[PDB]
């Protein structure tokens, strides 16, 4: 005799995932700020 | 500027990943379009050095005569990630996909 057959085709993959990362940052030396009220002065003691 | 691996093994922690499908066409468009297959369960290990690994292998059911050329991973059901299969694959009966292991880094 002469026989054949069927068998399920496989397959394998190794699938994966990557993302990263990143940061940041600003700034100064301050000097005086920010103020509403900003007028001439007299102090006293 | 960067995340410590501190920062990293925090923030892994919280993607919990269970399901995966596949597509074939790349799900970076709607998800949900385009879906082939259906979910199968996964399962991912703790993470160390930034870096968390499929615990063990999943088979994932073609139907048959269908096509496969991308995948998605899924959670409560919102898509976390998405890719391309190693090769495009035409299962013209039904047949097994296999995914030895898959892998998520923030390196």
């Known amino acids: ?45 | 500027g960067t995340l410590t691996i501190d920062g990293k093994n925090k923030i892994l922690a919280t993607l919990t990943p269970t399901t995966i499908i596949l597509h074939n066409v790349d799900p970076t468009a709607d998800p949900t379009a385009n879906k082939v297959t259906q979910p199968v369960a996964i399962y991912f290990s703790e993470p160390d050095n930034g870096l968390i690994a499929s615990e063990d292998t999943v088979n994932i059911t073609v139907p048959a005569s269908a096509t496969v050329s991308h995948y998605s991973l899924w959670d409560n059901d919102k898509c976390v990630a998405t890719g391309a299969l190693s090769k495009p694959q035409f299962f013209a009966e039904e047949g097994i996909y296999v995914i030895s292991s898959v892998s998520v880094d923030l390196n």
């Open chain 1, 1 to 45: 005799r002469v026989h054949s057959y069927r068998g399920v085709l496989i397959i394998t993959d190794k699938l994966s995932v990557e993302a990263g990362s990143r940061a940041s940052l600003s700034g100064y030396i301050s000097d005086g700020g920010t103020s509403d009220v900003f007028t001439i002065c007299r102090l006293l003691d």
